[PDB]
Each structure stands twice: as C-alpha cells, then as structure tokens.
C-alpha cells in the first residue's frame, strides 16, 4: 500500500500513496519490467466522467456539495441521450493541466499550474486550426521570452470525424532521402517531409527548412500552410570559445510543441491538443544533434576540435558533445531565448516532487526519461528512485494518421 | 507469450521467449513500475523442486536430459535431501552454475565474457584463515600483473544459517574513509562505516586518503577476524591526464581489481553467502562514480577549478567538461600502465552484440536499462536506443543484509 522511494545521495525517503489511485496499466507484470519499452461506448464513459468530476470537486474543495451531485447528474444525462457530453471551461483547464502534472516522462512539471489553456472545441476547418495554431505559436514564443501553453480542438466523436495535427511537432525541419545515400536535414522527418511533397510543398531542399504544417478537420483529407517566418523563432549556433563553430551552419528553433498526443479528459478524448513549453539544452545538443539516425554532427565538431578520433578511448565523442551542448546554451542565452540546462532542470525537478509527495502524496515519474542523456549521474535524478504510474487526466500516443486516415 | 524489443537506431526488431522461464518476480505490477528502485533457513518442502528444475537445465546444456545419467543424479539428489535436508553439487554443476548466474545478471553490461569465468571452488575451508588464503589466491590469479582475468571463489554454502561464510567487505579491495570532527571525509566516504567496523576489530588505521581496507572475514558462523591482504598483490594506478600535467597533482589512484565480495550465488535452491567475484573495469565506474559522485570522492570542483572553468553558472557545465577530462584521465592511466580496462563506448557496443547473440541461441537476454547505460554520455553508446526486458532467472546472484546487521556475536 505505502511504497517508499529514496534518494541515495541525500538520504531523504518519500512515502507514495499517490499510486494507489493510478487507473492505467504500466505494462509491467509481477514476472517482467518492461521499463525501458518505448510504447508498452456509453457504459464505458460514466465512470470516467464521474472518477474526473470527484476529482475535480475535491480539488476545490466541495466534493459531494450540490454543485457536485447536480454536475455528475447533467453529466450523467447527457451521456445518457447524445452518447457523450461537454467539459466546461473551468474543467478542461483542470484537466489540461492535470494531464502535464501527471505525464510521468516529463522532467519540466514544476511549471505544470502556469499553463495557458486555449480552447478550440469552436473550430470546424483546417484553415481555422492554422489560425488557432499560428496564435498558440505567437503567444507561446512571446519574443523569446516562452510561455507554456496548450491549444485543445474538438473532441473524437464516432471516430471518423477526427482532427489531428499531422505534423509530430509544430515547428521541424525537412528531411530528404538524396541520390548520394545520405541524407539532407532531419533524417526522422524523411518520411513525413515527402508526404508533404506528395500533397504539392515546394521544398527549398535545404539543411533546416522549417516544414509546413499538414492539419485535418473533421475527418477530412489534411491541407499544407506555412508558418509565417516572423512566427518562428530561431537561433544561430555559436560556441563562448571556438570561433569556428558558428561556420558549422548550424540553428534550431526555439519552441518545442508536441502536436502528435492525444489529450485524455473523463473519458473525452482530443486527439488535436498541441502543447508547447521551452528547451532543455540537451533535448537539441545531446539528442537533436549527436544521435546517430538524427544530424549526426558527432563526427565533423570532432575534425574541428582535431580530437584523437583513432581510439573510442580518447573520449572525443564525449568531449564534443559537451563543447556542443555549452554552444546551444550560449547561443539560445546570447539571445535571450527562454532555455534551461539539464542541471537546473533536474535540480527544479527534485524540488517538484518532495512538493508533490508532501502536497499530493506522490508524483509518477519515468526514470528512464526523467534522467539527462548525457552526464547522467552528475544530475540529482540519477541518485532518486522513482515510482512510475499512470494518473488520468493523461497524454497518450496515438498511431500516425496516414495509416489510419480513411481518404 | 512473444515478446519484441526494438532498437529505435538501427530498427533491429528481436523476440523474447527465455522470460516464460522466469520464476521469480521483478517489485512491479500491472499498476506501478518498479524499475527504478534499487531493492526492490530453507526446508526441504522448497529444495527438490528448485534443485529438479537446476538439474534439468544443467543436464540440456550438456545434451543429456533424459539420460540415465540424468536421472540417476535427480535420484541421487533426492535420496540426499530426504537423508540429510540438503545436498552437494558437483564440481561440474558449480562452475555451470556460477557461470549461469553472471549470464543471469541483468545490471551486468559485461556479460560478454559469461562462459570464460576462472571458478575456484573453496567449499573445503572451514576457517577465516583459509579464506584468507583462498582469497590471495583468487586476487593474485585475477590481477596477473594487469592482464586482468575473471574469476569467482565459492565457499561453502549455507545449512541451518546459523553457520554463514561472509567477506564483511563491499569489496575485496577498497579504500578507508574517515569521517573527521569537523563533519568532513578523509579518503572514500562510502567505506566510513565499515571503517569504523575494521577500527573497532583493532585495525590499526594509516589514516590516509588512499588506505586499502583489511579483509574481514567470517567462517561457519564465527565472529570475523582481520587480515592484511598482501601488498604486493594489490594492484594500484596512479592518475594521470595526457595533456593535462597537473593532473597527477591531485594525487589520485585507484586499484585495477573490481572485486564484490557481498552477494549470494544461488545455485538449484543452494545458497552461496560468500562468494566473491571480480572482472575488469568500464572506466566510468572510476571516473564517474567513483570520484565524481557527490558522495564520494567528490573531485570535480577541484578538477574544474585547476582547469580554470566558469563555475558562477551551471550552463557553462562546468561540471560536464571536467567529468570528460576526469574519464580520459583514467582510461590513459590504466591503458599505460597495461592494466586492463574497458570505455564505455566499446563496453556496450559489445554488451549489444552479446544481447543479439543470447537472444538468436538462448531466447532472451534479461537486461536492467537504468543499470546497463553508462553514468555519462548515455545516448551516445547504442544501449541508450535499445529496448530491454528485465526479468530474474536463477542461478542468480542476489543482495543480501550487511553481516553486521544481522550476525550474532559470541564474543
Ligand atoms: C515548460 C518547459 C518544459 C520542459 C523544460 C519540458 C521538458 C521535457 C523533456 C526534456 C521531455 C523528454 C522528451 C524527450 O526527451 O523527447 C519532456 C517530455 C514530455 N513533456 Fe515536458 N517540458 C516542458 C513543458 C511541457 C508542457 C507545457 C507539457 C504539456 C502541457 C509537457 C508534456 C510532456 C509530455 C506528455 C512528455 C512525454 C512525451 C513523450 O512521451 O514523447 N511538457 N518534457
Ligand atoms: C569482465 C568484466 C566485467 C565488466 C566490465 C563488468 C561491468 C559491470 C558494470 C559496469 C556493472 C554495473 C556496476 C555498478 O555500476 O555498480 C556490473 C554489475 C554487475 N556485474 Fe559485471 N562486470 C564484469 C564482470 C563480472 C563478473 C565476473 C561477474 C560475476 C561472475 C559480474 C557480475 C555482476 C553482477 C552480479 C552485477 C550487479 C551488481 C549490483 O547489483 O550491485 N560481473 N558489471
Ligand atoms: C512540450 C515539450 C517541451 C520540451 N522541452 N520538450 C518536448 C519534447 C519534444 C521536443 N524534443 C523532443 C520532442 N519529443 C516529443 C516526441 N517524443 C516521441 C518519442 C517516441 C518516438 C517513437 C515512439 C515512441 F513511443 C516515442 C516537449
Ligand atoms: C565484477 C565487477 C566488475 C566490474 N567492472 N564492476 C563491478 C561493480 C563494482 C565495481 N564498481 C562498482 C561496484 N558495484 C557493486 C556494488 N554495488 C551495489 C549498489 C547497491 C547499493 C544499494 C542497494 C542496492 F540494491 C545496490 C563488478
Ligand atoms: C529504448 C529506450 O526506452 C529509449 O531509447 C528512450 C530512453 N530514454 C529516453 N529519454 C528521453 N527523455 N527521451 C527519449 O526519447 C528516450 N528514449
Ligand atoms: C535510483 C537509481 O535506480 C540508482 O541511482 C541506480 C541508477 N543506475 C545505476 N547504474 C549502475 N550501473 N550503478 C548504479 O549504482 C546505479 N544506480
Ligand atoms: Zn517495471
């Protein structure tokens, strides 16, 4: 019932009781840990409605007062005739937010309360999600000075009348399969950048060309827009030290917005919620950068540096990466882009869930992910066990829609 | 039950069927994940179960389940346990079963090497002297003047638990630590209670930064008795950076024999309560853990400092570029000085290679992720992007309580 988690570096021991109320499978079993596994009606939704509406009064404090009952009997007979039923503002805020607090693989969650909630469930075509997201865009980048915030379109229905944001992110760069072998840009998006070629863009064919976005209302066949440059904020990669690393001919954007989740409130679901806060430096430096099946840099920062590259012993993967990561930091810093390095993160993190577990009894959290990918054990995460559950209101994924969408 | 990893750099989709296997359970549920948590007598009721089902793997190993052979040994072991409430392994089915528990081993990302273990086989020592002796000759054999080579030695198993062999060491080799008045630590402060456990037993304490801990030995359940392991078998490093001269200035060393001497071997329900085993290095676990822990050594303020790094701002990682400098700095040592050591980069490259390979020949390879990826640098070393399956199969070696917790005292 009550599960223990401690930190081994500073001794302090939190009491989980949080977890009790978890909902979801984890894809665990008594036999197997699948830790480390990257994706492990009407009767149905009134128990969802009222598990989210007793959460919600209790929030505020008035479970089972006559606002309470009265709402779960609305709810109730709402469902009851139309098959579903409709969140008010008031409680699709608390479910947003609630959905951050409780998404275990993020280590941002200290902020989780600050976010802007923008309502959409009003749209009704792709060219009114571009203005939706185009505002989410430009109040969210607030001119470099990032603010948290979540756009939410209308909700599934039958399941046929989906909206989705196609694009995995808002803002991304172009990846394009060359006659070479190799690849130009961002090789994750290979896929997706040719399906927009498929559906008529007109690719500048260049190493960071910001990609169109690619909206479906309504269940409809999904339509191209570009964003407008002055909406996207970028930021040229220079090094404190090394003159030369600014002629890498590299930039990243400075807003991360996750459009590909499915928003999961009471049993309603917005398959169309795309969410957006600021960069952890790693997120562009270690993984953005450095992966291997990404752009790679590894390699030519090293030629740079003229670092022993004969021996993986000499550590000059290991050095550039760090020069590379102090360049990102710098750069975003230098021109006052909102970015957090990955020790401060951590360290804000640490101090989110002793909050949690004294104001909540717990917080689920995702080792696995919570951890910097690189300098691990130098981080205060490292050293602190974690309990991962899965708490409604949540973000889930969904499959991508161009192996659903019925055209 | 099929069950697939991938991994999401290469695409390699592999399945695993070894975890039907599995016995025992892991800490999670269908509800929480555990995968983070550290920690998540026997009577002759449980024993022929457990040793049947050892049998019977050891005996397929060899091609011979089934045999005469086979079943005139389940017999043997039966009429044994009824007679005696336990039983004796074969020298045979030792060293199978000690093997088998490192290929066990799923925090172990050096499981590559699992069938080349040396297996010294002590189960004839009856005092501390002996293991003292036994243990000498398990340090010199493994060190051989730096071309290090794996070895476990076995003592005898436990009876009514009243009897134990234990090595009170973490380790075979460790450095004291030396908690002062003044709150501070001279030397390793991981080692400072087991330091004062030594003082106490009368150890004469050099109180130095460096000072390697005497073994602590107890046999058949007796109180422990102190030793000095020969120095001349302690092999040691000093410290040393390639391009940096004042690195060596710090005055840092370290041993060159990871050596555990804390964990239960259990073999077809035997349990194993002293049995230490070593390897060789990954640098990070010096470099890393060891010095750059906050609770360790703690080196790396002084690193950067000497590196004249701006420390006013963590984004200027500091920290980051002096735990590089610290990592070459070790790896140059030990690969000068011709003591073997492994690079975290090489370490799992090959770990991926020997998960591939048990997962084509065996079924599976149970791995622990938060375990197998390196302390630094994570997602630059191919397991970061490799999809794993932690599970427990047995033989296996298994934590077990400090012996001063729980030992009674005969004075
Ligand atoms: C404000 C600053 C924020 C920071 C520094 C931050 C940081 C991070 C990081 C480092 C990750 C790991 C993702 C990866 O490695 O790809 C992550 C994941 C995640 N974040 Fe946060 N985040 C922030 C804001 C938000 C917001 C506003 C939301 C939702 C409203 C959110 C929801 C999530 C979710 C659901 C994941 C898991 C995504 C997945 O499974 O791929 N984050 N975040
Ligand atoms: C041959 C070279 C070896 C290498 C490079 C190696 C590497 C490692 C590393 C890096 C760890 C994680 C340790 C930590 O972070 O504290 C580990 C754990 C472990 N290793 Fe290996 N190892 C080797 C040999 C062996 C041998 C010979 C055995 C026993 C026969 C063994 C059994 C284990 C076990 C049981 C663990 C888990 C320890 C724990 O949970 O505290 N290893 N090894
Ligand atoms: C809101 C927010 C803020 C922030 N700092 N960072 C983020 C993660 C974004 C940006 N930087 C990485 C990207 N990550 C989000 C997408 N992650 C998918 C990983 C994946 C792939 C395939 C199968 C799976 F099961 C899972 C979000
Ligand atoms: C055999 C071998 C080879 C090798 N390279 N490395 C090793 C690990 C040794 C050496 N370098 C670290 C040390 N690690 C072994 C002891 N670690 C126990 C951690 C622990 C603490 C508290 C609760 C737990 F459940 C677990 C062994
Ligand atoms: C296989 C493994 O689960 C996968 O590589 C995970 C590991 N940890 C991660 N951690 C974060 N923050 N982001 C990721 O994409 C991943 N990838
Ligand atoms: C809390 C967490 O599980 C703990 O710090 C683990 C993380 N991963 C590790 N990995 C290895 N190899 N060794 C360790 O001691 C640890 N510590
Ligand atoms: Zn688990």
């Known amino acids: 019932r009550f599960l223990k988690v401690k930190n081994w570096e500073t001794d302090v021991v939190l009491t989980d009781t949080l977890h009790l109320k978890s909902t979801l499978e984890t894809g665990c079993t008594e036999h197997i840990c699948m830790g480390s596994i990257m994706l492990p009606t009407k009767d149905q939704l009134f128990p969802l409605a009222k598990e989210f509406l007793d959460q919600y009064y209790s929030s505020i404090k008035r479970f089972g007062s006559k606002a309470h009952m009265d709402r779960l009997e609305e709810v109730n007979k709402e469902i009851e005739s139309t098959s579903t039923y409709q969140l008010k503002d008031t409680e699709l805020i608390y479910g947003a937010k609630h959905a951050w607090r409780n998404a275990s693989r993020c280590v941002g969650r200290i902020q989780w309360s600050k976010l802007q909630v923008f309502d959409a469930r009003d749209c009704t075509t ?4 571009f203005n939706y997201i185009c505002n989410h865009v430009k109040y969210a980048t607030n001119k470099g000075n990032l603010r948290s915030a979540i756009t939410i379109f209308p909700q599934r229905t039958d399941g046929k009348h989906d ?8 803002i991304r760069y172009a990846g394009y399969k060359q006659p070479d072998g190799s690849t130009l840009g961002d090789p994750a998006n290979v896929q997706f950048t040719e399906i927009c070629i498929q559906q008529g863009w007109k690719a500048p064919r260049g190493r960071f060309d910001v990609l169109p976005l690619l909206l479906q209302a309504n269940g409809n066949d999904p339509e191209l827009f570009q964003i407008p440059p002055e909406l996207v904020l970028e930021v040229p990669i220079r090094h404190p030290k090394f003159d030369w690393f600014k002629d890498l001919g590299l930039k990243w954007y400075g807003l991360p917005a ?17 969410f957006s806060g600021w960069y952890m430096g790693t997120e562009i430096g270690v993984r953005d950068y450095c992966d291997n099946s990404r752009y790679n840099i590894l390699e030519e920062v090293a030629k740079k ?4 590259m004969r021996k993986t012993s000499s550590l000059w993967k290991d050095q ?7 360049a990102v930091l710098y750069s975003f810093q230098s021109d006052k882009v909102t970015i957090v390095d990955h020790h401060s993160a951590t360290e804000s993190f640490i101090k989110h869930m002793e909050n949690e577990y004294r104001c909540r009894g717990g917080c689920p959290a995702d080792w696995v992910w919570i951890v910097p990918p690189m300098s691990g054990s130098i981080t205060p995460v490292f050293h602190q066990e974690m309990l991962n559950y899965r708490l409604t209101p949540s973000f889930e994924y969904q499959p991508d829609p161009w192996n659903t969408h019925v055209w």
């Open 163 to 170: 909206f989705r944001v196609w694009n995995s992110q808002l």
């Open 126 to 129: 792709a060219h009114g999600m």
């Open 305 to 308: 540096m003229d670092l022993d």
């Open 258 to 274: 996750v459009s590909n989740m499915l928003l999961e409130i009471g049993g309603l679901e917005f398959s169309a919620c795309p």
């Open 320 to 326: 550039a990466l760090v020069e590379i990561n102090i």
